[PDB]
Amino acid sequence: EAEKAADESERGMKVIESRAQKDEEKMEIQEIQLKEAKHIAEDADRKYEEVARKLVI
Amino acid sequence: DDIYKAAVEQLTEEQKNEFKAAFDIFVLGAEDGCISTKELGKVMRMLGQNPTPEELQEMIDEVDEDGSGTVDFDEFLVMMVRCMKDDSKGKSEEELSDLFRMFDKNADGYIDLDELKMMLQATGETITEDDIEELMKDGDKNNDGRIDYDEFLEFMKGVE
Incomplete structure (x- = not known):
């Protein structure tokens, strides 16, 4: 019984290992995506200020 | 000609914080501090400073006329401080x-x-x-x- 339980516990441990690795991958991908998002936001902000200036004039 | 020049000769830490922040943005170590005027304006707008393109275009028309794209620290600091x-x-x-x-x-x-x-x-x-x-x-x-x-x-x- 103990040896079978050991096999199953290692099974579960390895499954959680793999899932955590996949999650880290998705985390870094979303991280680079978020940086790109921030840059797009700043660009839009600058464009907005510019067009406001033009309209006032 | 001399006001910002004197200020840089007495380089203050308050401006130095932003200067070195943009430097590590630009120079990753053991570089000549090229920092082209186009890139310099891009980063100046990028890092939350004053987003005035007029000074940047003045630099672009004025700097990197050497053809090497490098910008010396003197005039780059002068235009950074005078942008503010x-x-x-x-x-x-x-x-x-x-x-x-x-x-x-x-x-x-x-x-x-x-x-x-x-x-x-x-x-x-x-x-x-x-x-x-x-x-x-x-x-x-x-x-x-x-x-x-x-x-x-x-x-x-x-x-x-």
Whole structure:
């Protein structure tokens, strides 16, 4: 019984290992995506200020 | 010519924080500090500083004329500090109006160019491309045949 339980516990441990690795991958991908998002936001902000200036004039 | 030059020669830590932040943005170590004027303006707008493209384009037309794209630390720091508003509010409007009425002898509701030339030659400064007609080019906005105190401000407001 103990040896079978050991096999199953290692099974579960390895499954959680793999899932955590996949999650880290998705985390870094979303991280680079978020940086790109921030840059797009700043660009839009600058464009907005510019067009406001033009309209006032 | 010398004000920002003196400030850089006495490089302060408050400006140095942003300077070195943009430096690590630009220079990753053991570099010549190239930092092209186009890239310099890109980062200047990028890192949350003043997003004024006019100074950046002035640099681009002015800097990297060497053809190497590198920008020396002297002029890069000068344009960085002068991109920020470095002026003591240009004295007082009423005080400057009194200064100009001392300057303006005609008191004809304005001041003519020749009085400005007299005061300029009284100052005793060197002449360069921004002389002779640069004042004429800038001040001739509506071309009223004069350089009023208001027109003189329109030309070179914030006189310090």
